[PDB]
Design an enzyme around this catalytic site. Structure first.
Site, PDB file in Angstrom:
ATOM      1  N   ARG A  55     -15.393  15.919   8.817  1.00  0.00           N
ATOM      2  CA  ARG A  55     -16.654  16.516   8.393  1.00  0.00           C
ATOM      3  C   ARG A  55     -17.896  15.946   9.074  1.00  0.00           C
ATOM      4  O   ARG A  55     -18.679  16.685   9.667  1.00  0.00           O
ATOM      5  CB  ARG A  55     -16.809  16.423   6.872  1.00  0.00           C
ATOM      6  N   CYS A 105     -11.871   6.065  19.822  1.00  0.00           N
ATOM      7  CA  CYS A 105     -12.636   5.919  21.058  1.00  0.00           C
ATOM      8  C   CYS A 105     -13.933   6.709  21.281  1.00  0.00           C
ATOM      9  O   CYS A 105     -14.615   6.481  22.274  1.00  0.00           O
ATOM     10  CB  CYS A 105     -11.685   6.203  22.222  1.00  0.00           C
ATOM     11  N   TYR A 115     -11.668  19.568   2.354  1.00  0.00           N
ATOM     12  CA  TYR A 115     -11.736  19.549   3.801  1.00  0.00           C
ATOM     13  C   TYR A 115     -11.686  18.120   4.303  1.00  0.00           C
ATOM     14  O   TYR A 115     -12.370  17.753   5.256  1.00  0.00           O
ATOM     15  CB  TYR A 115     -13.020  20.250   4.250  1.00  0.00           C
TER      16      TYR A 115
HETATM   17  C1  LIG Z   1     -12.998  33.945   1.764  1.00  0.00           C
HETATM   18  C2  LIG Z   1     -13.163  32.507   1.377  1.00  0.00           C
HETATM   19  N1  LIG Z   1     -13.020  32.121   0.037  1.00  0.00           N
HETATM   20  C3  LIG Z   1     -13.302  30.837  -0.383  1.00  0.00           C
HETATM   21  C4  LIG Z   1     -13.759  29.853   0.577  1.00  0.00           C
HETATM   22  C5  LIG Z   1     -13.850  28.475   0.015  1.00  0.00           C
HETATM   23  O1  LIG Z   1     -15.173  28.231  -0.419  1.00  0.00           O
HETATM   24  P1  LIG Z   1     -15.630  26.907  -0.882  1.00  0.00           P
HETATM   25  O2  LIG Z   1     -14.642  25.696  -0.620  1.00  0.00           O
HETATM   26  O3  LIG Z   1     -15.781  27.115  -2.443  1.00  0.00           O
HETATM   27  O4  LIG Z   1     -16.951  26.746  -0.075  1.00  0.00           O
HETATM   28  C6  LIG Z   1     -13.914  30.213   1.916  1.00  0.00           C
HETATM   29  C7  LIG Z   1     -14.590  29.292   2.902  1.00  0.00           C
HETATM   30  N2  LIG Z   1     -14.231  29.136   4.125  1.00  0.00           N
HETATM   31  C8  LIG Z   1     -14.721  28.121   5.100  1.00  0.00           C
HETATM   32  C9  LIG Z   1     -15.024  26.748   4.480  1.00  0.00           C
HETATM   33  C10 LIG Z   1     -15.284  25.725   5.578  1.00  0.00           C
HETATM   34  C11 LIG Z   1     -15.564  24.333   5.039  1.00  0.00           C
HETATM   35  C12 LIG Z   1     -15.671  23.271   6.147  1.00  0.00           C
HETATM   36  N3  LIG Z   1     -14.363  23.045   6.756  1.00  0.00           N
HETATM   37  C13 LIG Z   1     -16.234  21.971   5.585  1.00  0.00           C
HETATM   38  O5  LIG Z   1     -17.275  22.012   4.884  1.00  0.00           O
HETATM   39  O6  LIG Z   1     -15.617  20.922   5.872  1.00  0.00           O
HETATM   40  C14 LIG Z   1     -13.590  31.504   2.335  1.00  0.00           C
HETATM   41  O7  LIG Z   1     -13.586  31.843   3.679  1.00  0.00           O
HETATM   42  C1  LIG Z   2     -12.163   3.127  27.367  1.00  0.00           C
HETATM   43  C2  LIG Z   2     -11.796   4.537  27.714  1.00  0.00           C
HETATM   44  N1  LIG Z   2     -11.069   4.805  28.883  1.00  0.00           N
HETATM   45  C3  LIG Z   2     -10.832   6.094  29.312  1.00  0.00           C
HETATM   46  C4  LIG Z   2     -11.344   7.211  28.542  1.00  0.00           C
HETATM   47  C5  LIG Z   2     -10.860   8.535  29.027  1.00  0.00           C
HETATM   48  O1  LIG Z   2     -11.814   9.090  29.910  1.00  0.00           O
HETATM   49  P1  LIG Z   2     -11.708  10.462  30.442  1.00  0.00           P
HETATM   50  O2  LIG Z   2     -10.612  11.389  29.769  1.00  0.00           O
HETATM   51  O3  LIG Z   2     -11.315  10.221  31.955  1.00  0.00           O
HETATM   52  O4  LIG Z   2     -13.144  10.999  30.178  1.00  0.00           O
HETATM   53  C6  LIG Z   2     -12.074   6.972  27.377  1.00  0.00           C
HETATM   54  C7  LIG Z   2     -12.806   8.085  26.669  1.00  0.00           C
HETATM   55  N2  LIG Z   2     -12.900   8.205  25.394  1.00  0.00           N
HETATM   56  C8  LIG Z   2     -13.439   9.360  24.621  1.00  0.00           C
HETATM   57  C9  LIG Z   2     -13.123  10.732  25.239  1.00  0.00           C
HETATM   58  C10 LIG Z   2     -13.500  11.842  24.266  1.00  0.00           C
HETATM   59  C11 LIG Z   2     -13.189  13.230  24.799  1.00  0.00           C
HETATM   60  C12 LIG Z   2     -13.423  14.338  23.758  1.00  0.00           C
HETATM   61  N3  LIG Z   2     -12.426  14.249  22.696  1.00  0.00           N
HETATM   62  C13 LIG Z   2     -13.380  15.709  24.423  1.00  0.00           C
HETATM   63  O5  LIG Z   2     -14.058  15.903  25.462  1.00  0.00           O
HETATM   64  O6  LIG Z   2     -12.666  16.576  23.874  1.00  0.00           O
HETATM   65  C14 LIG Z   2     -12.273   5.664  26.934  1.00  0.00           C
HETATM   66  O7  LIG Z   2     -12.858   5.404  25.705  1.00  0.00           O
END
Ligand SMILES: Cc1ncc(COP(=O)(O)O)c(C[NH2+]CCCC[C@H](N)C(=O)O)c1O
Ligand SMILES: Cc1ncc(COP(=O)(O)O)c(C[NH2+]CCCC[C@H](N)C(=O)O)c1O
Lengths: 394, 394
Positions: A294, A322, A351
Site C-alpha cells: 500500500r 533493495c 489489501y
Molecule cells: C465492485 C467492487 N466491490 C467492492 C470493492 C471493495 O471495496 P472496498 O474494500 O469496500 O473499498 C471493490 C474495490 N476494488 C478496488 C479496491 C482497491 C484497493 C487497493 N488495493 C488498496 O487500497 O490497497 C470493487 O471493485
Molecule cells: C545493490 C544493487 N545492485 C544491483 C541492482 C540491480 O540494478 P539493475 O537491475 O541493473 O538496475 C540493484 C537495484 N535495486 C532496485 C531495482 C528496482 C527495480 C524496480 N523494481 C523496477 O524497475 O521494476 C541494487 O540495489
C-alpha cells in the site's frame, strides 16, 4: 499477551483480531434492518480461508472478481446464492464455471461480455441471472488508482449503452437481468459522491422497470474508507439513510460490497527491529514492501505503534528490500529502538497480505488469528516453496 | 513459431528468449577485457532457476539481497566465491548462513550491521570478508523509487562514517574489509552521475588504502537502463571507459551488478484479448497488474506488440483486476482486435514475474524459455496452490 506470542512465533507476521471482523460485519447487517439487504464481503480485501469461514458463520455473502475467489468463498462455507461475480475481464472458463456453481449473479461490465455469457448459458441450457454495472461518471474524490466511477475508468458502462444491454438481456432466453450495480471508488471519505451515484442509478432503475425489466436487487458496491490517519469516517447510519432516501419508490433488495471497512482495522503487521541507522535516522525492520504494498503503490500511511515498552525523534521506518519505495513511513516519530524491539503497522487487514508477493525471494508471511485464543490461519512459506515449480525446468 | 505455442499453452504467460540473456551477459564480460572484473547478475531482476543456470554456465556471479537469493544462485550452479550479499536489512540468520556458505563478501550498509556480522563471525571462528557500501549523495536522475544514491536514501553511508567503519573492520580479528561499493540507482539513462559516483568513491578508496585497508574489489553496482520507450541507452564502451578513467592508479578488480540490462529485453508477456469495450476504447486482456506491477508502481510504459496478424485507434489496454491502476498502457494505438487475438508486452524480463503476486486470487503465470526449442521454466500455479497453506487453519 505479546510475550507468549513472540516466544512461539518469529516475526514478521500478520495478526488478526477476529472480533473486530465479526463486529464490523454485524454493523453492516443492522444498518439496513428496515429492508432486505445482502452484505457481500469483497474477498479482494482479504480472502484468507479462516476469516471467510467466520463471515460465513454470520451468513455473509461474497463479492468475487475471479473463479479463484468464488472457490475460496464456497470452500469457506459461503452460500452460492449469496455470491456475486464482478469483473471486466472474466474468461469463458470463469463465466462457465460461475454458471454451474449457481451463484447469485454475474455483474457484467461490457456488452461483449453479456453476449459471451449468453452463448455459454445457452450451451449449458440455463438462464443466467445477471446484473449490469453502470458507470455514472461521478468523481469519488479519492486516489486515482482507487477511483472507478468516471467515464475515464474501464468499469461499468454509460446509461445509454446500459439501457441497450438490459433490453438485450430481456429478449434473450438465456439471460435474466435482475440487478443494477455501481461502485465509484475505494477508501472514500466523502458520502456525497456515493449519494449522487445512488440517485442517478435509482433514476435509471426506475426507468428500467417501466420497460419491463424485473429488477430485484440494487447493488451500491463498497467504498467506505477507514481512518488511516485519524480522519473522520462516513457513519453507517448516514450512509444507509442517504441510500434509502435515494431509493424512494423502489422496492428492491439492497446489496453492499464492503471490503476494507470489514477487515482493515482487525489486521496488524507485527515486525521486529533489526538495526538503527544514521543526518537522518533510519529504523530498519524485517517486513518489506513485498509484504505490504500500500505505502509504495498509493503513498498510503498506516499508523506505526511500538509494542515493546521503551527519546523520540524523526525517522524513516524501512524494510529490507533493495528499493527506495520500500519505506513504511517517512519522518515518523518514534522513541529510540534497539535490535529485537517489536512494532506493529496498523490497519493492514485489507489489501495487506492479499497483495503481497515474494519479491527479493522472501517467503509469504505467517498469518495468526486472535479469538479469545491465538491460532494460525496461514502457515509461513518455506524457502523451497519459492522455487518449487521451477525445479523440473532446471 | 507462435502457432504451435498457442496450441499447447494457454495464456497469459512469460516467454523468455535465452540467447538475448546469454548475449547481454557476454557483452558485460568483454566490456572489461583489459582488467579483472566480475559480473554479478542481480537476482532481484529475475531469479528463475533456469535463467540462473544459463548464467552459471557462462560463469556469472550473483548479487543477492536475501538468503533466498543466495540459495537460488547456489542451486543454479553459481560458485559461492562469485556471490555477493547486499542488503540494509540482513537478519542474523541470513548473516550467519551467508558466512557458512563462503560467499565472496557481505556488502554492509550500517555500522550496527558490521558489528552484528563480527559477533556472529567470531562465534563461528571465521574472518568475514566484507565490503562497505557508501552513499555518495549523488542524484542518479531517475524515478524516486528507483533512486538510491542520495543522503535521503537508506542505502550505504557517508564518507566520514565509512572511514570509521573500515578502520573498525581493520582492527577486528573477525572482519576483513576487501571492497568498496556503491549503487546510485536503477534504469539510468545518464552516464554522468555514474561517473561522478565512481570518481568520488575512487578518491576515498585511494584514501582507504593509504590507511592500510587492503582493498581488492571496486564494485559499481548495476543501474544501466533499457530502451522501454525507444530512448538512447548508455553504451557499455562509454560506461567501461568512464569507469577505467575514474580508477586511475587503483589496481582493483571491478565488479558490476547489472540486472535489468541482462534480462529485460529477453522476456515478453504474452497475453490474450478477451473483450473490446467502448467514448474511449478499452482492450481487456487476461494478464493483470498482479502479473506485472511496473506500470502501476512506477508509471512505466512497456511497448505492446500484436502477435496476431490483423483500423488503428487509441485505447487503454487493461487487465482483469478490479483497480484503475490495472491498465498496461493509456491511449495506446492498436488496430481493432477481437477475442482470442494475441499481444505481447515487451521487455518484461526484469522485475516482471519477480514482483508478481496472487492478488484477486490469480495463480502465478507459466514461464516458458526459448532455446532454439520451447520448454517450461516455471509451471503455472494451480488454483489450490493459492490457499494450500490456509487449509489447516480452516
Ligand atoms: C465492485 C467492487 N466491490 C467492492 C470493492 C471493495 O471495496 P472496498 O474494500 O469496500 O473499498 C471493490 C474495490 N476494488 C478496488 C479496491 C482497491 C484497493 C487497493 N488495493 C488498496 O487500497 O490497497 C470493487 O471493485
Ligand atoms: C545493490 C544493487 N545492485 C544491483 C541492482 C540491480 O540494478 P539493475 O537491475 O541493473 O538496475 C540493484 C537495484 N535495486 C532496485 C531495482 C528496482 C527495480 C524496480 N523494481 C523496477 O524497475 O521494476 C541494487 O540495489
Amino acid at each position: 499477551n505479546y510475550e507468549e506470542l513472540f516466544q512461539t512465533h518469529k516475526t514478521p507476521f500478520y495478526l488478526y483480531d477476529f472480533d473486530k471482523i465479526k463486529q464490523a460485519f454485524l454493523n453492516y447487517k443492522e444498518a439496513f434492518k428496515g429492508r432486505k439487504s445482502l452484505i457481500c464481503y469483497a474477498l479482494k480485501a482479504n480472502s484468507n480461508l479462516s476469516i471467510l469461514s467466520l463471515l460465513a458463520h454470520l451468513e455473509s455473502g461474497a463479492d468475487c472478481v475471479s473463479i479463484g475467489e468464488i472457490q475460496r468463498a464456497l470452500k469457506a462455507g459461503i452460500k452460492p446464492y449469496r455470491i456475486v461475480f464482478s469483473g471486466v475481464g472474466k474468461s469463458a472458463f470463469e463465466i462457465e464455471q460461475a454458471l454451474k456453481l449457481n451463484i447469485l449473479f454475474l455483474n457484467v461490465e461490457s456488452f461483449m461480455e453479456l453476449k459471451t455469457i449468453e452463448t455459454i448459458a445457452q450451451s449449458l441450457g440455463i438462464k443466467a441471472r445477471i446484473s449490469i454495472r453502470i458507470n455514472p461518471n461521478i468523481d469519488a474524490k479519492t486516489h486515482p488508482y482507487l477511483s472507478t466511477g468516471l467515464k475515464e475508468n474501464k468499469f461499468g458502462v454509460g446509461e445509454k449503452e446500459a439501457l441497450e444491454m438490459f433490453l438485450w438481456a430481456k429478449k434473450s432466453a438465456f439471460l435474466e437481468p435482475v440487478s443494477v450495480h455501481f461502485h465509484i471508488g475505494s477508501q472514500l471519505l466523502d458520502l456525497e459522491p456515493i449519494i449522487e451515484a445512488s440517485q442517478k442509478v435509482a433514476k435509471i432503475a426506475k426507468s428500467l422497470i417501466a420497460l419491463g425489466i424485473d429488477l430485484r436487487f440494487f447493488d451500491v458496491g463498497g467504498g467506505i474508507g477507514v481512518s488511516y490517519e485519524n480522519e473522520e469516517t462516513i457513519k453507517l447510519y448516514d450512509y444507509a439513510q442517504g441510500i434509502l432516501n435515494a431509493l424512494q419508490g423502489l422496492d428492491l433488495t439492497i446489496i453492499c460490497e464492503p471490503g476494507r471497512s470489514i477487515v482493515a482495522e482487525s489486521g496488524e503487521l507485527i515486525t521486529q527491529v533489526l538495526y538503527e541507522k544514521k543526518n537522518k535516522r533510519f529504523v530498519i525492520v524485517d517486513a518489506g514492501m513485498n509484504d505490504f504494498l500500500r505505502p509504495s503503490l498509493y503513498h498510503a500511511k498506516h499508523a506505526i505503534r511500538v509494542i515493546t515498552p521503551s527519546e523520540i525523534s524523526p525517522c524513516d521506518v524501512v524494510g529490507p528490500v533493495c528499493e527506495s519505495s520500500d519505506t513504511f513511513l517517512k519522518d515518523a516519530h518514534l522513541p529510540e529502538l534497539e535490535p529485537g524491539d517489536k512494532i506493529a503497522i496498523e490497519k493492514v487487514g485489507a489489501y495487506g497480505s492479499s497483495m503481497a508477493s515474494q519479491y527479493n525471494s522472501r517467503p509469504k508471511l505467517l498469518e495468526l488469528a486472535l479469538e479469545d485464543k491465538i491460532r494460525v490461519i496461514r502457515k509461513r512459506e518455506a524457502l523451497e516453496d519459492l522455487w518449487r515449480l521451477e525445479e523440473e525446468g532446471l
